[PDB]
Amino acid sequence: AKPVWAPHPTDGFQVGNIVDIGPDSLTIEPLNQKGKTFLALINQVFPAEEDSKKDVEDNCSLMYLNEATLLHNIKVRYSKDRIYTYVANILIAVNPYFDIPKIYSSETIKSYQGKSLGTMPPHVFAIADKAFRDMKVLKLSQSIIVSGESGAGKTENTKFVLRYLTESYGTGQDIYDRIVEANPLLEAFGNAKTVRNNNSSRFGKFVEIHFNEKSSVVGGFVSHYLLEKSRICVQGKEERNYHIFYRLCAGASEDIRERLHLSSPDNFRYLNRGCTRYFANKETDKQILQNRKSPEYLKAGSLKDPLLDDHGDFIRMCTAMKKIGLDDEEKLDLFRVVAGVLHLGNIDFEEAGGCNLKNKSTQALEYCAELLGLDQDDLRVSLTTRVIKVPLKVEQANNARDALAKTVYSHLFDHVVNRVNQCFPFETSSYFIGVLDIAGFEYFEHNSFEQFCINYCNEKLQQFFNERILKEEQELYQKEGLGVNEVHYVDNQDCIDLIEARLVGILDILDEENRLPQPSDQHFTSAVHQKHKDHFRLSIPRKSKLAIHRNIRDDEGFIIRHFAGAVCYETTQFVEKNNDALHMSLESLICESRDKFIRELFESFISVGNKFKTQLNLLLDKLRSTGASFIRCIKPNLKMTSHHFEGAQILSQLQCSGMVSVLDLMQGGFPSRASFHELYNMYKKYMPDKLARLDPRLFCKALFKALGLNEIDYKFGLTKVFFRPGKFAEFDQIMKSDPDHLAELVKRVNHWLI
Ligand SMILES: Nc1ncnc2c1ncn2[C@@H]1O[C@H](COP(=O)(O)OP(=O)(O)O)[C@@H](O)[C@H]1O
Ligand code: VO4
Ligand SMILES: [Mg+2]
Known part of the structure; x- marks a missing residue:
């Protein structure tokens, strides 16, 4: 017969022949497994390309445009180490999880310059060049939106785009060294090992490259969003704090280690709940001194990754700082604050007749105060009391300590981003090309406010894609009288409204809780379920498809049906995590440091959720004002391995990202x-x-x-x-x-x- 595509539970689709049709269903015979059959619905079976070995660079060039042929075409390319494939002028990128030779070389960069889409193979470089050409010709600033779930490849592709544009259209080694070589610095402070991604971004960024009237690079500007704060103090056992802590511990000279009083990561509360192992290979493990290695590292050996290496990355980061123009004083200032935060975390408290510092914490106190330029007594007082003084319980002292740690590190990160911007400043520009790299859709066995905020942001980004590519595109066709067949799709604005709506949206209901005389996570959670009973996008935890979530009580969590999949959140600590305010006692202490660097870091309730919404909407305003290009990154498997194409997982991404819908629209678009x-x-x-x-x-x-x-x-x-x-x-x-x-x-x- 003629081979068709029919459902397969792990492959998404499989090849077979139709061997019967009935009023209710079809009967399929899998290729090569003759005699065996299975039933499929007519609407679940798709025509297949006649040649199953060929591939096309643009999926619109398929004989049959449907989700099954899309999946197969991407699969064939992926098997030949072609990770990039078009749908018209949109790029799909599948993470290869290894370094494919030469495809990002300076020679390859040159070969893409000025070339029209389709005249060269699909590549992130072609998307970048097309953005550059539209900027130059349409006289309109451009955005390149790199989407996908955690680990799909957004950051690596963002970096390819930046390298391409700066090497191609910026004159000199300098402006390249500055925009590109700034990255190891941001990643040191803003990236961390999660279970989905060894190099996970825990902040979002929009990096603008600015150009003069002659379309030559004049400078850059990085906007950053919502650094993950809880991570600064505690991680799960398979995750790590921000890379900088490990790079410093593994890579610092003895002289620096002594001056900062560092040691192996097991020695610090702020690292030791997490994985205390370094990324290293056989060679680099030899370069890390034994006194930096935790007992877990000594037993289990190093973490393995083809990219990350804590010792090598420390050196690379130091080289980066030099190249962009940080002097050695600035470097050491960064490290001192990083160490101060670590020693801050080692301070323990015990119930007093209030509470006191445990006797064993005296040193941590001394090291912290020293490094942060604080008087020890002021610090002791600020951690154990509040304002008329009021003594704190141990639990409260723990929170005060951690709150100070979070605010110090977060201001440190702000300074790092600012300092990077000061490496490539410009007085004026004609246009820019901006690249968006957010923290991607993620979920775990336990999901909290951090995941809620990340997934919310991803929801908002997918809505922008829908608005631009699926809604506005069709309105344009209609307005112009083209008679293109309408493509219907599931929109996610209702999900956004559930979260965002004035007064009754989740974020506003959370704020309300924060402002109550006795704020309660359970009270907030009940109010949400109450105000949104029978909302399509909201469920109680026991309805979860996963056993692990069903044991969660109604007022202890909720499920959000995101565009990319249901996620069950535990709402414990949502109220605490929603408040960005720091006690003035703690603020003044740090503001009045004897150290100039520390003061300069710092120039009842502040809603984290609504501050974020506000920043994202300002970002979205900026995106709307630009011509937009899209790169859809796809994660091929859950194991970080190469040449392991999980068809069902990939199909699910193609569907929820809107690529199947766009392929449909391009049949007549x-x-x-x-x-x-x-x-x-x-x-x-x-x-x-x-x-x-x-x-x-x-x-x-x-x-x-x-x-x-x-x-x-x-x-x-x-x-x-x-x-x-x-x-x-x-x-x-x-x-x-x-x-x-x-x-x-x-x-x-x-x-x-x-
Ligand atoms: N094009 C690529 N070439 C080689 N490795 C890649 C590529 N894209 C992703 N990776 C690998 O996958 C990991 C995760 O990608 P990253 O861009 O950090 O994901 P995210 O989408 O979360 O930013 C990287 O650390 C790197 O190991
Ligand atoms: O793992 V990523 O947060 O950088 O989407
Ligand atoms: Mg990233």
């Missing part, structure tokens, strides 16, 4: 377009009298023919002319404004009229 009037007028200037007499519509048809299009490749709308997928190269030639180019084509067409 038109990804390129331009104003007819403007297009005609551009050529009109050069037209001999006979050609200028020619009907403008007829001229355009002749132009398109001359530049290689068939009538099915384009379509005139009311005011714009539209072009099909796969025709970007011809579109670009048609739109080319170079006076020499214009003249030649005008000559050619006017010749037909003799």
Whole structure:
């Protein structure tokens, strides 16, 4: 028979032949497993490409456009170490989990410069170049949105884009060294090992590269969002604090180790609940001194990763600081605060006749106060009392200590981002190309406010993609009278409203709890379920598909049905985590440090959730004002391994990211377009009298023919002319404004009229 695609539980789809049809279902015979059959629904079976070994660079070029052929085409490419594949002018990128030779080389960079989409193989570099060309030609700033769940490859692709644009369109080694070599610094302070990603970003960023009128790089600017705070003090056993702690412990000279009073990570509360092992290989393990290694490292050996290496990354980070222009004083200032936070965490309290510092904590107190430029008694007092003085219980002292740790580290991070921005400043610019790299969709056995905020942000980003690519695109077709078949899809605005709505949204209900005389997580949680009974996007934990979640009580958690999947959150500590305010007692202490660096870090209730919403909406305003390009990163498996394509997991991402819906729309859609009037007028200037007499519509048809299009490749709308997928190269030639180019084509067409 003719082979079709039919469901498979782990592969997503499998190859088979239809061997019966009935009023209720079909009967499929899996290829090669003849005699065996299974039933499938008619609506679940798809036509397959005749050649199962070939692949296409643009999925729109498939004979059959559907989720099954999309999946297979990406799979074949992935098997040949081609991680990049288009859907029209959108890029899908599947994490290879290893370094594929040469594909990011300076030679490869040069080969993408000025090349139209489709004239070179799919690549993150082509997306970057197209953003650059639109900026230069349309005179419009550009955003490149890199989406995907945790570990899918957003950060690595963001970095490829930045390297490409700076190496291609920035003059000198300097501006490259500055924008690119700034990255090891941000990652040291803002990235950490989670169970999904050894190099997980725990903050979001929008990095703008700014250009002058001549489209040459003049500088950069990084905006950062919502560093994860809880991580600073505690991690789960398979996770780590921010990389900087481990890089410093493994890599610092003896002189620096002594001065900062560092030791192996098992020695610090703020590291020792987490994995205390270093990333290292056989060689680099030899370069780490024995006195830096925890008992767990000594027993279990190092963590393995093809990229991360704590000792090697320390050295690389130090080299980075030098290259961008941090002096040694600035470096040591950074390290001193990092150490101060570590010693801060080692301070213990015991019930007094209030509470006191345990006798064993005297040293930690001395080291902390020293490193942060504080008087020991002031510090002791601020941790054990509050304001008329009031003595604190041990639990309260623990919280005060940790709150100070979190605020100090967070201000340190703010300084790092600012200092990076000061490495590539600019007074003015004409346009920018910005790249968005957020912390991606994630969930674990236990999900808290951190995951809730991250997933909320991912929800908002996916809504932007929907708004731009699925909603506005179709409204454009409609407005222009193209008669493109409407593609319906599940929108996630209702999910956003559940979280965001004034007064009754989850964030506002949380704020309300914070402002109550006796704030309670259980009270907040009940109010949410109460106000949103029968909301499609909200469930009580016992309804979870996973046994681990069902034991959670109704007022102890909730399930949000995110666009990317249901996530069950434990709501314990939501109220605490929602308050960004720091006690003035603690603030003044740090503000009045004897140390200038410490003071400069710092220049009842503040809603973390609503501060975040506000910052994200400002970001979204900026995105809306730009031309937007999209790279959809895909995580191939849950094991961080190479050449292990989990078809069902990948299909699920293709569906929820909207790529299946976009592929559908591209069956009759038109990804390129331009104003007819403007297009005609551009050529009109050069037209001999006979050609200028020619009907403008007829001229355009002749132009398109001359530049290689068939009538099915384009379509005139009311005011714009539209072009099909796969025709970007011809579109670009048609739109080319170079006076020499214009003249030649005008000559050619006017010749037909003799
Ligand atoms: N194109 C790529 N080439 C090589 N390794 C990659 C690529 N993309 C991702 N990786 C690997 O996968 C890991 C996670 O990718 P990353 O971009 O950090 O994920 P996220 O989407 O969470 O930012 C990286 O640390 C690196 O090991
Ligand atoms: O693991 V990532 O947070 O950087 O999406
Ligand atoms: Mg990342």
